[PDB]
Amino acid sequence: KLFPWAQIRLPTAVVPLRYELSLHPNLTSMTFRGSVTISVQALQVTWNIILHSTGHNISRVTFMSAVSSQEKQAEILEYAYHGQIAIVAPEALLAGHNYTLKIEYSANISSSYYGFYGFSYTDESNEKKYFAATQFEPLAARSAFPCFDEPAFKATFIIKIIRDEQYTALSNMPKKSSVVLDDGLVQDEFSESVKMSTYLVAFIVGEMKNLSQDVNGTLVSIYAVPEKIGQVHYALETTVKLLEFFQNYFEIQYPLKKLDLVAIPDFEAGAMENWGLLTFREETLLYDSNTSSMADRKLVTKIIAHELAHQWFGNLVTMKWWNDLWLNEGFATFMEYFSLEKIFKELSSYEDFLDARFKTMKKDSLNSSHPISSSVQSSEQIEEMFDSLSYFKGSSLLLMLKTYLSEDVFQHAVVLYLHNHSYASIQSDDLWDSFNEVTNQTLDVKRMMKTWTLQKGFPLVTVQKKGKELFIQQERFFLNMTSYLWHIPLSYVTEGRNYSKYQSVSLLDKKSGVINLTEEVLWVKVNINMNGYYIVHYADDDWEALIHQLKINPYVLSDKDRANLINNIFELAGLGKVPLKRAFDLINYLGNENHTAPITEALFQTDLIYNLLEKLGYMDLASRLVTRVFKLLQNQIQQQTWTDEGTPSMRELRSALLEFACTHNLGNCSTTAMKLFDDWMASNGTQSLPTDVMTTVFKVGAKTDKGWSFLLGKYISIGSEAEKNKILEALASSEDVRKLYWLMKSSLNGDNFRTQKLSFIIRTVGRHFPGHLLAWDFVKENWNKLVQKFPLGSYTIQNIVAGSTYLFSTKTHLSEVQAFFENQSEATFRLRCVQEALEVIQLNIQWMEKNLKSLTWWL
Amino acid sequence: XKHHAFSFK
Ligand SMILES: *[C@@H]1O[C@H](CO)[C@@H](O[C@@H]2O[C@H](CO)[C@@H](O[C@H]3O[C@H](CO)[C@@H](O)[C@H](O)[C@@H]3O)[C@H](O)[C@H]2NC(C)=O)[C@H](O)[C@H]1NC(C)=O
Ligand SMILES: *[C@@H]1O[C@H](CO)[C@@H](O[C@@H]2O[C@H](CO)[C@@H](O)[C@H](O)[C@H]2NC(C)=O)[C@H](O)[C@H]1NC(C)=O
Ligand SMILES: *[C@@H]1O[C@H](CO)[C@@H](O[C@@H]2O[C@H](CO)[C@@H](O)[C@H](O)[C@H]2NC(C)=O)[C@H](O)[C@H]1NC(C)=O
Ligand SMILES: *[C@@H]1O[C@H](CO)[C@@H](O[C@@H]2O[C@H](CO)[C@@H](O)[C@H](O)[C@H]2NC(C)=O)[C@H](O)[C@H]1NC(C)=O
Ligand SMILES: *[C@@H]1O[C@H](CO)[C@@H](O)[C@H](O)[C@H]1NC(C)=O
Ligand SMILES: *[C@@H]1O[C@H](CO)[C@@H](O)[C@H](O)[C@H]1NC(C)=O
Ligand SMILES: *[C@@H]1O[C@H](CO)[C@@H](O)[C@H](O)[C@H]1NC(C)=O
Ligand SMILES: *[C@@H]1O[C@H](CO)[C@@H](O)[C@H](O)[C@H]1NC(C)=O
Ligand SMILES: *[C@@H]1O[C@H](CO)[C@@H](O)[C@H](O)[C@H]1NC(C)=O
Ligand SMILES: *[C@@H]1O[C@H](CO)[C@@H](O)[C@H](O)[C@H]1NC(C)=O
Ligand SMILES: *[C@@H]1O[C@H](CO)[C@@H](O)[C@H](O)[C@H]1NC(C)=O
Ligand SMILES: [Zn+2]
Numbered sequence: 101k102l103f104p105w106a107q108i109r110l111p112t113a114v115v116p117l118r119y120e121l122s123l124h125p126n127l128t129s130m131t132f133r134g135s136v137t138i139s140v141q142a143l144q145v146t147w148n149i150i151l152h153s154t155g156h157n158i159s160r161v162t163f164m165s166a167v168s169s170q171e172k173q174a175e176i177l178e179y180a181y182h183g184q185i186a187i188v189a190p191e192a193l194l195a196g197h198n199y200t201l202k203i204e205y206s207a208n209i210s211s212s213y214y215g216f217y218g219f220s221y222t223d224e225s226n227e228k229k230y231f232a233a234t235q236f237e238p239l240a241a242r243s244a245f246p247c248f249d250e251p252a253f254k255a256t257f258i259i260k261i262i263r264d265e266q267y268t269a270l271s272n273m274p275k276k277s278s279v280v281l282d283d284g285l286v287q288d289e290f291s292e293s294v295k296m297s298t299y300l301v302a303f304i305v306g307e308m309k310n311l312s313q314d315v316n317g318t319l320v321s322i323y324a325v326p327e328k329i330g331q332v333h334y335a336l337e338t339t340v341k342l343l344e345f346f347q348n349y350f351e352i353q354y355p356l357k358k359l360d361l362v363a364i365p366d367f368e369a370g371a372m373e374n375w376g377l378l379t380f381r382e383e384t385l386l387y388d389s390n391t392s393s394m395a396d397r398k399l400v401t402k403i404i405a406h407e408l409a410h411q412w413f414g415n416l417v418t419m420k421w422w423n424d425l426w427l428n429e430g431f432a433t434f435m436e437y438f439s440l441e442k443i444f445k446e447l448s449s450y451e452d453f454l455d456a457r458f459k460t461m462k463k464d465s466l467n468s469s470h471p472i473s474s475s476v477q478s479s480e481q482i483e484e485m486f487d488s489l490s491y492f493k494g495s496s497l498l499l500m501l502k503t504y505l506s507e508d509v510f511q512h513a514v515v516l517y518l519h520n521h522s523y524a525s526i527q528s529d530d531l532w533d534s535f536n537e538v539t540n541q542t543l544d545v546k547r548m549m550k551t552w553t554l555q556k557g558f559p560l561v562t563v564q565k566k567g568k569e570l571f572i573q574q575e576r577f578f579l580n581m582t583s584y585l586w587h588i589p590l591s592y593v594t595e596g597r598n599y600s601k602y603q604s605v606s607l608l609d610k611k612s613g614v615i616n617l618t619e620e621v622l623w624v625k626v627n628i629n630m631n632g633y634y635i636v637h638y639a640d641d642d643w644e645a646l647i648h649q650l651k652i653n654p655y656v657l658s659d660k661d662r663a664n665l666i667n668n669i670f671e672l673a674g675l676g677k678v679p680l681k682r683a684f685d686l687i688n689y690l691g692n693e694n695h696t697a698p699i700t701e702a703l704f705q706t707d708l709i710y711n712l713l714e715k716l717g718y719m720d721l722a723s724r725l726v727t728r729v730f731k732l733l734q735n736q737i738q739q740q741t742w743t744d745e746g747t748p749s750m751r752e753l754r755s756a757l758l759e760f761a762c763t764h765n766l767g768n769c770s771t772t773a774m775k776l777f778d779d780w781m782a783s784n785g786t787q788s789l790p791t792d793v794m795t796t797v798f799k800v801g802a803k804t805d806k807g808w809s810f811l812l813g814k815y816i817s818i819g820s821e822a823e824k825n826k827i828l829e830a831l832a833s834s835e836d837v838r839k840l841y842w843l844m845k846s847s848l849n850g851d852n853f854r855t856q857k858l859s860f861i862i863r864t865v866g867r868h869f870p871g872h873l874l875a876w877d878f879v880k881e882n883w884n885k886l887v888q889k890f891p892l893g894s895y896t897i898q899n900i901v902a903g904s905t906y907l908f909s910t911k912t913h914l915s916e917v918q919a920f921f922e923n924q925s926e927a928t929f930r931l932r933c934v935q936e937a938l939e940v941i942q943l944n945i946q947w948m949e950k951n952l953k954s955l956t957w958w959l
Numbered sequence: 960x961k962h963h964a965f966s967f968k
Pocket of ligand 5: 157158206
């Protein structure tokens with residue numbers, strides 16, 4: 101019989117209710133055998149059950165009915181196209197009657213790292229151990245066991261895996277029945293999983309050691325490989341405090357007895373939020389309190405908070421389809437940075453969030469941008485949806501939605517949202533619906549969010565204060581080469597009477613509006629702490645009004661405010677809406693700034709212009725530029741110390757200012773670094789380097805054939821991977837072109853550097869002048885082997901191309917890049933990343949056309 | 960999840 105179902109999506113007909121999954125995995129032969137009991141129910145009438153299965157050889161497929169424990173055969177129907185199978189059920193099953201479906205099969209554990217995958221490694225004591233695991237998001241679950249692989253099909257799961265002795269079997273639900281067998285082949289059984297989606301099932305097998313402590317009735321525990329079990333003491337201490345936070349904030353308890361964060365011992369692992377079985381990359385969980393830095397700590401906190409908050413948003417409440425993927429990931433990313441601002445207020449993670457949002461708007465403002473709520477009908481369109489825009493734009497709205505409504509009003513809308521839809525499937529509108537339950541009254545709708553969800557980019561708010569009235573105008577943020585309108589939650593701040601800290605909130609929802617100022621005011625800053633996902637372009641007089649204010653007392657606003665202004669003006673000066681001289685006229689206050697967040701972002705914008713110029717041929721112009729910026733920050737830079745002393749926020753600024761003054765060579769900043777490196781290099785690297793200066797010091801030393809050759813030694817040897825990654829950066833900061841090419845050519849086939857490091861190398865080599873042309877040449881001249889080693893549409897093959905072309909700014913280069921991709925295929929030439937790259941270079945030219953002549957008549 | 964470098968993109 102030919103396949104009775106011809107659509108992508110599974111028919112609404114049959115529905116799973118209870119899953120039983122029994123497996124026997126052979127880790128040393130990369131194969132296994134498994135059995136699946138699928139308690140299905142009927143809703144409509146059909147002669148076939150349609151579900152998902154890929155890459156299997158199936159023993160028997162048996163059928164059954166209610167209260168008659170006999171089972172009759174029923175042939176199978178594979179199509180492998182959509183990854184669908186069909187049971188040609190003999191008795192036309194009917195609405196209301198549950199049926200049990202059993203399938204036993206054999207298949208391969210995966211050689212790659214997607215689906216049910218295994219891998220090998222070596223021990224502390226050089227003993228070749230083994231390991232296996234799962235990554236099922238978003239469509240991999242069907243590769244393991246035949247099932248209903250769509251997210252809106254929640255059900256229960258009984259998992260059992262027949263492992264070996266010294267191994268540890270783990271899965272979503274806790275162990276309960278372990279029953280040794282007669283060959284030393286222990287078998288475990290895990291509890292019936294609560295109602296959850298297929299993609300969220302997990303089970304792993306490998307030699308591990310626990311570290312636990314149960315709080316409020318829930319066993320939190322960081323499982324991992326034997327040796328590293330000592331470095332997981334920050335992981336656990338944090339997971340408790342954060343689980344304690346989320347349970348309290350959501351007013352729902354974590355509906356499990358245990359919570360397992362396993363640090364998979366592989367560099368190509370998949371971090372994932374499986375219920376009860378959280379997965380991490382080993383590197384990204386180990387935090388040594390002694391040797392590790394702030395960037396090491398911030399990451400480990402941030403990545404746990406994201407995985408935890410996912411238990412609520414994404415596990416409990418799961419979206420109905422991948423078009424609303426942003427609902428989980430946008431929320432997980434919001435609760436991520438939000439939990440930290442409440443519990444880990446030391447980290448100053450709001451800074452990270454701000455810069456993150458910065459870099460999101462720059463990408464959302466492009467033409468390649470796709471709205472977060474976007475029709476998804478294929479499977480590559482699904483992979484696509486796991487992009488920056490979903491995580492951070494989505495996050496930005498919830499923040500904008502948060503700071504608009506009361507903080508308390510945001511929580512209530514969540515608590516109720518979480519309550520109403522628990523263990524069910526969600527839609528974008530359904531979040532909005534339980535978001536308008538109150539105040540108390542439906543004083544406002546969330547049709548307001550329907551412009552932010554359905555169309556790409558963000559508004560450009562234009563502002564003209566002409567006395568006591570403030571004229572607002574909105575428009576699409578476009579980059580020269582209708583539709584739109586937004587429901588914008590406007591906020592503003594000014595000083596009025598006795599420095600009256602006046603702030604207010606509005607909602608422009610038409611092409612034009614006006615805000616009524618209480619008094620007369622000398623300056624007015626719109627969009628406070630960039631809570632709103634948009635850019636504000638003031639009029640000439642009001643720009644210059646804020647600049648004057650900044651030069652007098654720039655602390656009447658927050659650090660976020662000040663950072664936001666620097667961002668917006670440079671990005672406006674880019675598109676031509678403002679002369680670049682005014683952008684620099686704004687930062688002139690920076691001589692009197694002690695807050696990192698404005699300084700980092702200001703150092704970013706100017707470093708970009710320096711690098712863009714440099715790669716053309718304007719070395720003089722570029723060098724005169726960084727000195728202008730240096731003189732502003734001269735005091736701060738001198739005043740810095742080469743230690744690890746201060747708040748996270750302050751140690752960040754230290755790393756920023758130092759890495760800066762050393763890169764272009766400014767003041768004593770070098771030599772000091774060169775001194776330290778000589779000391780460190782002398783002691784065979786037994787001297788502790790202050791991880792805040794570690795990268796700078798490493799880089800400076802790497803400019804000598806000796807110091808460089810040393811740092812290569814300390815890479816092929818030592819184990820500190822965060823240190824190893826700071827060393828590699830230095831290696832690829834060498835000006836000796838030969839050394840740079842040797843790095844790229846080596847890293848490719850993985851001789852002294854893993855091929856995962858290749859992207860990082862090509863990028864770093866290509867940011868600085870000597871490597872610049874050499875990086876892009878490496879990409880072209882080895883493109884075929886690049887496409888072999890990386891899926892032609894994974895984050896790596898994009899990161900490489902963007903990383904090696906985003907600095908070209910000439911018509912001539914534009915044609916060269918375009919032509920190279922043309923001469924491949926059009927199926928590569930029309931690929932999201934490559935078309936986007938061309939847009940960047942096009943925009944780079946536009947920037948030069950608009951500002952280069954302007955820039956020259958300074959000095 | 961989606962961490963490596965960048966954040967941003
Ligand atoms: C639990 O979540 C339900 C959503 O799944 C929610 O129901 C929704 O209720 C609103 C009104 O309260 C309905 O909205 C309507 O009004 C607009 C404008 O008039 C119309 O265009 C719509 O078609 C609709 O008539 C939603 O349609 C409705 N959603 C669903 C799926 O039924 C419940 O209120 C929530 N329950 C609790 C106790 O919070
Ligand atoms: C996978 O299959 C192999 C072969 O049947 C099993 O093999 C053994 O591994 C243990 C180590 O734990 C050795 O002591 C035995 O000598 C091996 N047997 C043979 C015949 O070489 C292995 O146990 C299976 N794995 C699982 C998890 O069942
Ligand atoms: C994965 O399992 C399959 C079986 O499902 C193995 O298949 C042989 O694969 C070739 C295709 O290369 C088929 O023509 C044969 O019919 C398969 N044999 C059998 C007995 O099914 C496949 O070899 C496994 N993967 C690896 C890497 O060995
Ligand atoms: C929340 O706001 C509503 C707004 O109506 C308050 O309202 C009710 O008001 C209507 C008239 O508008 C009365 O007929 C009802 O008797 C009121 N209900 C109650 C329970 O008083 C409501 O009181 C507000 N609730 C809170 C907690 O502030
Ligand atoms: C399926 O696996 C069994 C296991 O021994 C094997 O005998 C059989 O030939 C396989 N079937 C196919 C179609 O490959
Ligand atoms: C099985 O079906 C009966 C009615 O046919 C229903 O009452 C029962 O709830 C179903 N089983 C489960 C576990 O829900
Ligand atoms: C975790 O370690 C404690 C240490 O006493 C032990 O009691 C407990 O059984 C361990 N849990 C597991 C699942 O091994
Ligand atoms: C602003 O004030 C004017 C009176 O000068 C009034 O007509 C108008 O409705 C007010 N609008 C808003 C948005 O406050
Ligand atoms: C930064 O400067 C402001 C005054 O402009 C001052 O109030 C604040 O204490 C300073 N903070 C630090 C850390 O120097
Ligand atoms: C270089 O600048 C630092 C910063 O204050 C200073 O302490 C040091 O003495 C300076 N070195 C020389 C040789 O002037
Ligand atoms: C330097 O340290 C490395 C670390 O692995 C060691 O192998 C080497 O023997 C040391 N050499 C000296 C001279 O201390
Ligand atoms: Zn996530």
